[PDB]
Amino acid sequence: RFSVAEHQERYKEECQRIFDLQNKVLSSTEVLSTDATGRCLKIYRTFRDEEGKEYVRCETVRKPAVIDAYVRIRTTKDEEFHREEMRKERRRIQEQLRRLKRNQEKEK
Amino acid sequence: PHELESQFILRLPPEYASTVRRAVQSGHVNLKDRLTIELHPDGRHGIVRVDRVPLASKLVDLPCVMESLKTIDKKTFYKTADICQMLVSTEKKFIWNHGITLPLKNVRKRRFRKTAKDVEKEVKRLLSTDAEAVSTRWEIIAED
């Protein structure tokens, strides 16, 4: 039931074997011959055309890679509930400054 | 300022490679007139003209990373540039599977570990279309 020399020697020999296989393969000048849900994603899009129209586009994504990246943003944006917020902050700063100026007028 | 030099590898057909090699090792400026390189605005297509004879070229991506290493004493070597592209002369087509050395052949297919979960750009385009829209309806689907 070795817990000491057996493990150490086994690791050492596997190390020498891999080192020696890599050296040989790499220095070879031999020529080498040239050789979960199963569910797709479909999106419906509603847009307005020039003049007056309301066409709807149904687009199906069968690439599971595109799927993963697409959904992950929605799930994030669904939990994410901004230029508008920055504008609101600017309005807040303006109001605060006006209030401070009113305070200065009251003091003087 | 200093701009890092951009080195790539040029692969020629073997007879044209022998003429270009003889003209390089000769060292005259006669080679300058003989060998020209025209790169097309595709970015992955060209002509290499050896002795005014046009050859069709493709700039391909190499699977490994090479590095040019210069030396003055042949004991200490200084890295000068990274090479990753080759203008072979005679997208998926612009990717080279083999490496330059003989042991590295079919490296991308066999000696490269592949880990997987363009696509990101397509997802960004889809998000932009959803934004330009009004109502979006989504369902993970089944066979249909």
Give CA–CA dist B134/A54, Å, rounded. 10
Going by C-alpha positions, the residue among B129, B142, B118, B117 that lies closest to residue A43 is: B129
Give CA–CA dist B104/B64, Å, rounded. 9
Going by C-alpha positions, the residue among B85, B29, B79, B80 that lies closest to residue B57 is: B85
| A41/B123 Cβ within 8 A | no
Q: Residue length, chain A? A: 108
Torsion of CA A89, A90, A91, A97, to 10 degrees: 110
Buried (b) or exposed (e) across B1-21, using 16+ Cβ within 10 A?
Answer: eeeeeeeeebbbeeebeebbe
Q: Could you tell me if B56 and B44 are in contact, meaning their C-beta atoms sit under 8 angstroms apart?
A: no
Q: What is the experimental method?
A: cryo-EM
Residue B108: closest C-alpha in chain A: A35
Give CA–CA dist B52/A12, Å, rounded. 60
Half-sphere exposure in the Cβ direction for A13 (13 Å, CA):
5
Distances (CA, A) of A2 to A6, A10, A23, A39, B26: 6, 11, 31, 50, 68
Cβ contacts of B7 within 8 Å, gap of 6 or more: B68, B80, B81, B83
Give CA–CA dist B142/B140, Å, rounded. 7
Show the beta-strand stretches assigned E in chain B: 9-11, 35-39, 46-50, 53-71, 77-89, 136-140
Distance from CA of B139 to the nearest CA of A (A): 6
Q: Which residues pair with B63 in a beta bridge?
A: none
What one-character DSSP code corresponds to residue B95? B
Residue A22: closest C-alpha in chain B: B103
Show the beta-strand stretches assigned E in chain A: 41-46, 56-61
- Radius of gyration of chain B from its Cα atoms, rounded to whole angstroms: 22
Give CA–CA dist B101/A28, Å, rounded. 10
Distances (CA, A) of A94 to A82, B29, B44: 18, 71, 54
Select the residue of B106, B119, B138 nearest A32 (Cβ to Cβ).
B106
Resolution value in angstroms:
6.8
Give CA–CA dist B15/B51, Å, rounded. 12
Q: Which residues of B touch A26 (CB under 8 A)?
A: 103
| A25/B141 Cβ within 8 A | no
